[PDB]
């Protein structure tokens, strides 16, 4: 089964491959069907599930909580990760897309998540996105609260610059469990702007999203050189899909990311986890980086 990995120093133990429920609404699944998927997948070793405040027009959490209700023997078998801090226009109040890292708003959003997911606590609450109007102290207080309430085990951020990650960290008595960022051959800025260097330094494991560029890896016609290279290496590693070569290219960064699977097909989720068994060489790594970029390392 997929190895286990303590994400931070005092952090929790997640499953190296996290299952993400962002497109949940799109998979169109009755709580009956879902609970089946939720089983098959956490039987592979994928026990960590990713969620968020705004997901599915604020429907995804709720939809998932219907599954845990008719299959309550599940909760103990997984780790629930969720976020909050964004204001979608899916609500009449928000006439524009913005952020709400306001003390009371978080505690409002967190307790709603517990309610929607029909769970008594969350394992990870992530400040969804970095806000220009964020006040470290306000967020720290919402956190001390949710904590001494047992409603949230750990805390983390998402898409934070090292400077923003540090800002909020100066206000906390506990080490930020993670910093969910995007990492894939098509999106490699975090590899050198210092984000992944700070994360390796603090021994914090970043959950990596959209490893498949959101799916535009197999569709976007500007990535043929990258898909050709991936196919080549795929034969050299004896992999099943270029996707596995990617989930490995990512898997082997020194900061040690936990790739988040976004597919709604349990068989595609089966393949993924296999990438963990593949062993990619350094020259195979740079060979895929090159094919995705067009130039060589400095």
């Amino acid at each position: 089964l997929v190895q286990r990995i303590t994400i931070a120093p005092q952090g929790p133990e997640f499953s190296r491959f996290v299952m993400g429920y962002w497109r949940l609404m799109d998979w169109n699944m009755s709580a009956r069907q879902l609970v089946s998927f939720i089983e098959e997948h956490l039987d592979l070793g994928v026990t960590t599930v990713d969620h968020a405040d705004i997901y599915g027009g604020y429907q995804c959490e709720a939809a998932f909580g219907e599954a845990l209700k008719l299959a309550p023997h599940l909760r103990e078998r997984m780790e629930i990760v969720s976020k909050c801090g964004i204001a979608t226009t899916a609500r009449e109040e928000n006439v524009i897309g913005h952020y709400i890292t306001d003390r009371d708003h978080i505690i409002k959003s967190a307790e709603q998540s517990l309610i929607n997911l029909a769970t008594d606590h969350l394992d990870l609450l992530l400040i969804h996105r970095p806000d220009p109007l964020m006040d470290a102290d306000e967020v720290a207080d919402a956190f001390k609260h949710l904590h001494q309430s047992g409603k949230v085990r750990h805390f983390g951020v998402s898409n934070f610059t090292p400077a923003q990650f540090a800002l909020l960290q100066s206000r906390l008595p506990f080490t930020l469990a993670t910093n969910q960022v995007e990492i894939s051959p098509v999106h490699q800025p975090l590899l050198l702007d210092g984000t992944l260097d700070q994360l390796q330094q603090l021994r914090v494991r970043p959950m990596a999203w959209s490893c498949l560029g959101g799916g535009r890896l197999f569709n976007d016609d500007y990535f043929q050189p990258l898909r050709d290279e991936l196919a080549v290496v795929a034969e050299e590693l004896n992999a099943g899909s270029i996707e596995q070569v990617v989930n490995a290219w990512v898997l082997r960064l020194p900061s040690q990311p936990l790739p988040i699977i976004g597919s709604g097909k349990i068989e595609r989720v089966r393949a993924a986890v296999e990438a963990e068994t593949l062993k990619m060489t350094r020259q195979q790594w740079f060979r895929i980086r090159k094919a995705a970029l067009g130039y060589d390392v400095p």
Copy 2:
């Protein structure tokens, strides 16, 4: 009276809003007039004045000292901020515009400002601009020498990046009081590049400078939103919205009013009363940049 605010840990307490005298020479004033101006704005609550070594061809400090020498009771109600580190071509000695951050010169110019401003001490001494040749140690000697003489109470920097701020700080025995930077809807690079993050984290407050927004026309949509939010908040002018836009950043800036019109000073100062909501802030931000947050 405008709000009070201790700009930093162990730091001084300035007035939420600051008065900038960089354009003093353009106000076409006379000590006689300038004394009624100084009297009015601090009567309005604006008790912090921002000067600089060079401002006005090296004579805005001098001119402000004449007004003070005609009113020997004003230099107590106010806190004087001044700077040094730049060298303009206004001098005949300076061929090229450059910086000068060596010890003897940071002291030589601090005492000069003391002379020009008709006073025996400055409340804040800022290292005007980040210098490629700045030797954090030479600089730390000048700052400790002045702090002894009691001729300079607190020290700070200006337009420094988190790395240059830390380079200096590390050599100083006392907290840097501020980091005067540029902030406005027409200039937000500091909101995310880490310069405001460092400041909020250290609990230091930046005196935002330059809060041509009305002049430049590519900034019409921005002007239309300020006007549409002014209505909502019931603000006298769109400039009040701007000041309040800046005023509401979590790092808590001290806007520097640069107008010589005492009517505009009062209006900007009344930007506080405004209760701008989160959505209006992102609404103003977007009309300026043109795009939403990530």
Copy 3:
């Protein structure tokens, strides 16, 4: 002779001007000659030498090994600096150019340097360039080992970011001795990107490569205004050549850099070291900055 400087808190003591053997093979020098060159430069004071894994298709170290061989009474009069971490196409095992920073590799290529240079130890070992796959624990691990076995005296990094430098340092019990980076009037991103601000802050002196921009300062059409300036500040300073001013421009920096000479002509290696007496004034410094960039501050 050239002044002596201690590059880091508890680091080694080099000579303000180091000798770089990147183009050694281009000098078409023979073991007997090279020994005369080496002989002469350390007689000026340029005692420290800069080498590296890859340099000269992996030949340079070895060539310097022959110069040290037929005259091994020199090694105790110089400080050897070498690097590892890069993997060029110059070799056949490499289908692409990349970086290799595994533990076993660093240990393997350090011991390899000792063999090629014909010495029992290195004074400083640098990990050539920052790697996306670099694992600090693995590097810090290869460094302790090489340190406890007396093969390497000090450790540094090269072309590192203040975050990559800070990352590696967090795993090391000993102060990184330097961050060999490129510094010249034609390459300034480091004077303001915060790289040299860190080094000055930590009191770690950086070794500066390509101060004359690989030499295109005198060739490239693009730098006429700059050459005309180095020429005006030259007479002003009574400098020997524009190169010397370029060296004086670098020493002037507050992080106190160590310019690396890359000239294969001992006469040029003599002249350049003379820039150590010229006293450049800020205004001249900013005038050389301007002629190079095209704008003020």
